[PDB]
Point group: C2
Chain length 222, copies 2
């Protein structure tokens, strides 16, 4: 995240850090005891999931927090890496997450009314500048949902299953934030997917959660 600030400890208990062989790869969110939500882009190309771990309960990359193992990853069958569509995936855990004050699930948006031009929150460990290193401390930032009609004109091949944000140059998502949660009114409305490599004044694009609620419920771990 570019232009954000260090998040208070425990303020975002639903935040997940997906780490590959110990290194942060993408953000994700806790849906329930056995399921974590992320972007397909983050797990589609992985050959060995035994090296992918789910880290929760911590604001720092230097800390392990509570670590959970991945049983499998379910990628939306319609995910298109070229057109950047249906960028959504579920990570199933081998053992259930133990909730506490620092680890809690987040509700999914099932109603996107009145979201446009209103505030929303983004969190993540992505770079704080293009070509920059990942910050150790979780970052937070308040953005604005960019009207769909405008985003369709501003970005490349944006469709109804996308949602966008935009404030100004100097504020936005960056490498490492992908898969992370965009929230508003206590519900996750988007999954960080793509944009124009870090806060250059162009909208950031997210997978619209409400468009995949059905798919998510159908693929939740048994």
């Amino acid at each position: 995240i570019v232009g954000g600030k260090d998040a208070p400890v425990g303020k975002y208990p639903y935040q997940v850090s997906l780490r590959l062989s110990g290194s942060h790869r993408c953000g994700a969110s806790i849906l329930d005891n056995n399921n974590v939500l992320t972007a397909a882009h983050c797990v589609d190309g992985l050959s060995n999931l035994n090296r992918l771990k789910v880290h929760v309960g911590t604001n720092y990359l230097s800390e392990s927090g509570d670590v959970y193992d991945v049983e499998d990853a379910v990628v939306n069958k319609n995910y298109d890496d070229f057109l950047l569509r249906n960028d959504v995936a579920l990570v199933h855990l081998t053992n259930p997450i133990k909730f506490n004050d620092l680890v809690q699930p987040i509700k999914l948006s099932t109603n996107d009314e009145d979201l446009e031009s209103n505030p929303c929150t983004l969190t993540g460990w992505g770079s704080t500048r293009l070509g920059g290193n990942t910050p150790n401390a979780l970052q937070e930032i308040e953005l604005i949902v960019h009207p769909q009609k405008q985003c369709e004109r501003d970005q490349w091949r944006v469709i109804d299953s996308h949602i966008c944000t935009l404030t100004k140059r100097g504020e936005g998502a960056c490498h490492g934030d992908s898969g992370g949660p965009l929230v508003a009114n206590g519900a996750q409305i988007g999954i960080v997917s793509f944009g124009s490599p870090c806060a250059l004044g162009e909208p950031d694009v997210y997978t619209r959660v409400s468009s995949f609620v059905s798919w998510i419920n159908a693929n939740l771990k048994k």
Copy 2:
């Protein structure tokens, strides 16, 4: 291409337009009678290559030019779409291309000395503005090779098998240019791979051809 100009007819005989079901998808270049060079990103996600056609001998998308059928596509086994590495692929043609004044192959760079800070040429049918429609006429633009040492600091995870370009905001590659040829001194030195969605003052990144000459020769059609 943003900030370019209409290319003269026949000036770039090695330019290819890869079209999927009749619509431009990516650029590419002619290596010889049976092989076309492009980015792995352009063909990795395709399942039915019978829908993909190679178009040469024309500067316009509204024209068909000479059309060739695809027998197979060979993607570098080390292609990583998350880290954006080894973005290179070969498209094998079922029948040989007939060369003429409008259709000719291009030489591959096997020596990248003195390229940095010097001019190079990029051609393609990519958008002329982020979120814009593809131009009908092939566009051309003269760029400058951005020093590797600087590009490594400016972009995300740039490595030795990448080459970069950069001039200023308002000039650069855009959606639809991927897979296209970056040339200098009559040799292709790069394959359009990624960047920060259209000429925003950040370097555009290409697959460095010289780094894959061996791989290319080893996978050329028999």
